[PDB]
Amino acid sequence: SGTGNMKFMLNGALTIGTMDGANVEMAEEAGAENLFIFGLRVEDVEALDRKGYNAREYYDHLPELKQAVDQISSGFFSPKEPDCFKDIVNMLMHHDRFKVFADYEAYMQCQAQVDQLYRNPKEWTKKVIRNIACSGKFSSDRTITEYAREIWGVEPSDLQIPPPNI
Amino acid sequence: SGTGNMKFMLNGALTIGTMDGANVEMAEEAGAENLFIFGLRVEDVEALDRKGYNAREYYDHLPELKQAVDQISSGFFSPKEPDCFKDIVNMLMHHDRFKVFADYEAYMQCQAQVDQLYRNPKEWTKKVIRNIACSGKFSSDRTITEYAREIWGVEPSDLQIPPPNI
Amino acid sequence: QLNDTHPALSIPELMRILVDVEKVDWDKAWEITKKTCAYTNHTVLPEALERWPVSMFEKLLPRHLEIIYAINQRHLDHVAALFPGDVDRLRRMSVIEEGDCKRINMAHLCVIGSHAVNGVARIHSEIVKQSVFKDFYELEPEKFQNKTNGITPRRWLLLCNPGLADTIV
Numbered sequence: 199s200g201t202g203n204m205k206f207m208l209n210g211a212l213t214i215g216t217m218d219g220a221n222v223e224m225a226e227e228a229g230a231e232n233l234f235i236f237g238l239r240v241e242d243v244e245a246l247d248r249k250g251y252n253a254r255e256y257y258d259h260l261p262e263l264k265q266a267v268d269q270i271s272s273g274f275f276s277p278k279e280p281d282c283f284k285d286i287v288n289m290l291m292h293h294d295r296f297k298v299f300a301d302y303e304a305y306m307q308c309q310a311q312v313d314q315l316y317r318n319p320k321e322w323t324k325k326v327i328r329n330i331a332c333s334g335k336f337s338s339d340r341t342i343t344e345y346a347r348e349i350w351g352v353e354p355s356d357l358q359i360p361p362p363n364i
Numbered sequence: 365s366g367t368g369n370m371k372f373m374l375n376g377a378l379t380i381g382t383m384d385g386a387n388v389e390m391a392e393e394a395g396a397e398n399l400f401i402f403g404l405r406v407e408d409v410e411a412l413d414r415k416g417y418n419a420r421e422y423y424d425h426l427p428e429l430k431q432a433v434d435q436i437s438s439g440f441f442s443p444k445e446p447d448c449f450k451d452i453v454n455m456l457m458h459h460d461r462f463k464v465f466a467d468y469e470a471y472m473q474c475q476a477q478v479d480q481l482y483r484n485p486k487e488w489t490k491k492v493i494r495n496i497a498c499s500g501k502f503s504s505d506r507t508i509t510e511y512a513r514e515i516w517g518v519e520p521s522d523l524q525i526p527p528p529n530i
Numbered sequence: 531q532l533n534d535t536h537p538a539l540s541i542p543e544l545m546r547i548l549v550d551v552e553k554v555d556w557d558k559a560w561e562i563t564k565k566t567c568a569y570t571n572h573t574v575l576p577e578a579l580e581r582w583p584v585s586m587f588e589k590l591l592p593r594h595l596e597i598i599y600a601i602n603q604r605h606l607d608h609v610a611a612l613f614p615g616d617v618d619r620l621r622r623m624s625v626i627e628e629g630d631c632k633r634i635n636m637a638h639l640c641v642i643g644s645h646a647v648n649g650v651a652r653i654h655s656e657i658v659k660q661s662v663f664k665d666f667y668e669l670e671p672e673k674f675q676n677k678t679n680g681i682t683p684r685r686w687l688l689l690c691n692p693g694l695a696d697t698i699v
């Protein structure tokens with residue numbers, strides 16, 4: 199699930215995300231076009247595991263990524279200790295189970311669409327209003343009413359506490 | 365290096381190995397044809413890291429290997445707890461830094477050459493005699509004489525302890 | 531003879547006994563140290579090499595830490611003399627490494643405090659020279675050697691295999 203997702207949606211933020219957890223039901227509530235969904239889908243992740251993920255192929259044929267990884271590796275971001283991120287780079291190339299490189303291109307393209315929408319203030323805030331208006335489902339009142347009726351066998355507001363005495 | 369390598373060579377065993385450590389100097393001493401050298405060379409390992417190792421490609425297109433891995437995975441060797449080797453299989457397909465699949469074909473072919481030589485007792489033992497005769501270098505006497513002259517500045521047999529008194 | 535970095539503390543401890551107990555002059559004690567000690571390395575790639583946090587040394591061995599710091603400074607002054615302005619060479623060659631905490635590279639301490647450094651096979655010894663301690667090799671090639679390992683012919687032949695031993699005899 200995720201609940202941070204829900205907090206940003208209610209407070210006027212647009213969402214850049216993958217099609218998993220809360221993002222799915224958030225897309226379904228507000229329409230996927232009002233969200234910046236990108237990258238591998240659950241089934242695509244599975245299909246990449248069938249092919250076998252070779253992160254090297256991505257690093258080799260994506261120049262903006264190769265430059266970024268080389269800087270991290272060569273010590274451009276760590277001049278005094280240039281091998282500080284060796285284990286990060288080693289992981290991204292050989293043991294990356296979370297397919298960071300495989301989703302980089304899709305993520306970059308998706309961030310460009312974010313950049314083009316922010317460039318137009320009015321259409322940015324219009325999409326925001328569409329998000330906020332469709333977030334009502336993600337109230338814990340709704341969740342708790344659900345638990346109460348379908349699990350606990352209690353009805354909300356069947357107990358009415360009256361004003362106290364001092 | 366390795367020293368177990370040396371122990372088998374002196375005691376009449378033939379060696380199936382990669383071109384690394386002690387095996388290299390053992391090949392050089394007895395001639396590489398008298399040893400069952402196989403698989404990736406140091407430089408080939410490096411070249412596979414440049415390509416990126418995708419163990420899935422090996423499992424997919426090597427039928428004898430696919431059958432073996434599937435048995436390990438499905439619980440053929442562990443009927444009562446069929447997910448016992450899940451982490452072994454997961455490692456060989458996604459995190460195998462030691463390139464087990466990449467060397468399987470070369471290793472199988474090499475073991476067949478071992479099988480064909482054992483089928484001929486006389487030529488097996490001839491190769492053995494060639495190994496034993498060329499193992500003399502791997503005496504710790506040689507190593508220690510080397511340390512003594514090139515590092516310690518002592519000469520062996522410069523001290524001659526005479527027969528004791530009871 | 532230091533079989534790996536496990537007995538690496540031999541360098542600052544010999545320095546300690548000579549200078550603090552035996553009242554020998556620092557420089558003399560150091561030239562004595564380097565000539566008595568030799569180091570054998572058994573590993574490939576520099577990340578397998580033994581490191582200790584300096585905080586651990588602050589508590590357990592405060593005098594050895596002081597000696598290590600003095601050995602390192604004098605060593606980097608020498609490097610600074612031979613290669614002026616090479617700031618990254620100083621960081622690579624230092625016995626003390628920076629990171630999430632300061633650490634003491636015991637292998638670097640062994641190289642600096644030994645007259646000889648050997649690998650255990652011909653190509654491994656080439657890796658020890660050219661890759662593991664590249665910068666140290668550039669400064670003192672003659673220090674670096676090879677001592678291909680061996681096994682004893684008594685235990686690993688005469689004892690375990692008397693039958694084969696007799697047939698050869």
Ligand SMILES: *Cc1c(COP(=O)(O)O)cnc(C)c1O
Binds near residue numbers: 199200201202203
């Ligand atoms: C809401 C909230 C979370 C939950 O975040 P997820 O990544 O969506 O699980 C975590 N921490 C804090 C402080 C929060 O307020």
Ligand SMILES: *Cc1c(COP(=O)(O)O)cnc(C)c1O
Binds near residue numbers: 365366367368369371
């Ligand atoms: C010789 C010996 C070794 C060394 O084996 P390598 O894999 O060559 O390092 C290890 N254990 C025992 C009991 C030995 O006799």
